[PDB]
Ligand binder design. Structure first.
Ligand SMILES: [Zn+2]
Ligand SMILES: [Zn+2]
Length: 478
């Protein structure tokens, strides 16, 4: 279950152990309904819901957007697959669900994938048309990779206010379903069926993001003393909620970064820290006040923090970072018991090229990545998965030169980089400050690491020996 290629090229980390509910009350529910209705209509000002098609689903399936992918392509080509979809949709239009599989017979597999299409048909517009994208939603970050999220926190840091602060009920589900009020009747019926029966047993990412935006809007309202204690059991003067949303809702949305259950909020002051009563009544929490962060570069978001670094020419980038033990520990884990050398080497290359794109600023990872890429045949294609995060978009899964990919991601298509001058040398690309690298787990200066770095070419040649000296290798170390 260990990746032997990564393990052999990371010997200093062999001794690193880090590597080796009651209902919300009536007033709370009315607040939730008011805020949810408001936000859905704001999100729908510039977008109209639509039914996604069989043809869109087929096009998506053919690009995986294991060997199950070949089975899925065969399924969507099968007329029997779509006849079964048509029959189950007949049930959905009556508010029932019968053949859908939510959690090995080919019939069971067809109806699991058919359930996925029915969800995509009814609710795929949320992702396909980027309803929770930051442009449309203020607080969402849908579509952004780890290479961009840090810029959002940097922008939020510029707003005045306090520090930065970092379980779906049936009532949350009812509020999510309010989007169906913007649909035609057929579409609304299809969406209500998918919402109800998926819950009863990615679209849930968009709906999770919506619910979290509502929750954070409510927390700000409590923090700013618009909502009072008695409003938990009976909302007095509900129009005050509408007035606050009108006056302040968009400003507060733009003070948020929300990705599913992950969120950062920049409130207008630090009353936010103890605004926990509606949060708790909604079952979303303990009464300890939240601890805020004064430094935006330390705020955790989507398992990372984000650091502003400068190229030699003075242009800045904002990079994702996490403790190095987590990155090396994951790369050393192989999920396949088959333990094929080629599949293992190709997965190691995937991790190395990920590090070159996103974690190049870690001294240990740039060296270890170049060692891995020098030890795996240059023609072998990266395979496997290196992260479960929706914000790791997989640009490293390629045989293209990673400096060209780096340039595309950080320069060419980076909207925060107006100067599009290409970077022609890896030596122009910065590391973290040494103290910051050390803070996040770097072994620089540790004698076993120095020895590993000094003899890394010997270790690379040993891996090549094991994989096969007649393969073709490139030298990324010199
Ligand atoms: Zn069904
Ligand atoms: Zn870090």
């Amino acid at each position: 279950l260990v990746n032997g290629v990564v393990r052999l090229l990371s010997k200093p980390w062999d001794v690193v152990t880090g590597v080796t509910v009651p209902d919300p009350q009536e007033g709370t529910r009315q607040v939730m309904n008011i805020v949810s209705s408001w936000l859905w209509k704001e999100l729908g000002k510039r977008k109209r819901p639509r039914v996604c098609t069989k043809e869109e689903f087929i096009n998506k399936v053919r690009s995986n957007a294991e060997k199950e992918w070949k089975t899925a392509v065969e399924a969507v080509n099968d007329p029997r697959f779509w006849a079964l979809v048509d029959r189950e949709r007949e049930h959905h239009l009556r508010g029932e669900c019968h053949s859908c599989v939510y959690n090995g017979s080919r019939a069971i597999w067809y109806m699991w994938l058919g359930a996925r299409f029915l969800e995509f048909e009814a609710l795929g517009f949320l992702n396909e048309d980027h309803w929770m994208g930051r442009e449309n939603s203020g607080g969402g970050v849908e579509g952004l990779g780890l290479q961009r999220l840090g810029y959002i926190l940097e922008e939020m840091n510029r707003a005045p206010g306090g520090k930065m602060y970092a379980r779906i009920s049936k009532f949350d589900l009812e509020n999510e379903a309010l989007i169906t009020n913007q649909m035609e009747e057929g579409h609304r019926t299809l969406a209500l069926a998918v919402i109800k029966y998926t819950y009863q047993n990615v679209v849930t990412y968009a709906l999770n993001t919506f619910t979290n935006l509502v929750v954070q809007l409510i927390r700000n309202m409590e923090a700013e003393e618009v909502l009072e204690m008695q409003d938990l059991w009976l909302l007095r003067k509900p129009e005050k909620v509408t007035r606050w949303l009108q006056s302040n809702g968009w400003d507060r949305l733009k003070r948020m970064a929300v990705s599913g259950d992950d969120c950062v909020v920049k409130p207008i002051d630090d009353r936010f820290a103890h605004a926990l009563r509606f949060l708790n009544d909604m079952g979303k929490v303990e009464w300890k006040p939240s601890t805020g962060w004064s430094n935006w570069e330390e705020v955790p978001f989507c398992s990372h923090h984000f650091n502003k670094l400068y190229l030699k020419d003075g242009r800045s980038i904002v990079v994702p970072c996490r403790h190095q033990d987590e990155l090396i520990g994951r790369a050393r884990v192989s999920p396949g018991a088959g333990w094929s050398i080629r599949e293992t080497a190709c997965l190691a290359k995937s991790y190395a090229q990920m590090w070159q794109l996103l974690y190049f600023h870690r001294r240990d990872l740039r060296l270890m990545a170049n060692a891995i890429c020098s030890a795996v045949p240059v023609d072998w294609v990266p395979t496997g998965r290196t992260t479960w995060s929706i914000h790791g978009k997989g640009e490293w899964m390629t045989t293209e030169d990673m400096l060209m990919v780096w340039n595309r991601v950080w320069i060419e298509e980076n909207d925060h980089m107006e100067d599009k001058t290409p970077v022609t040398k890896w030596t122009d690309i910065p590391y973290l400050g040494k103290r910051e690298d050390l803070w996040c787990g770097s072994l620089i200066g540790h004698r076993p690491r120095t020895t590993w770095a000094e003899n890394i070419k010997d270790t690379v040649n040993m891996v090549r020996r094991i994989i096969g000296d007649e393969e073709k290798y490139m030298d990324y170390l010199s």
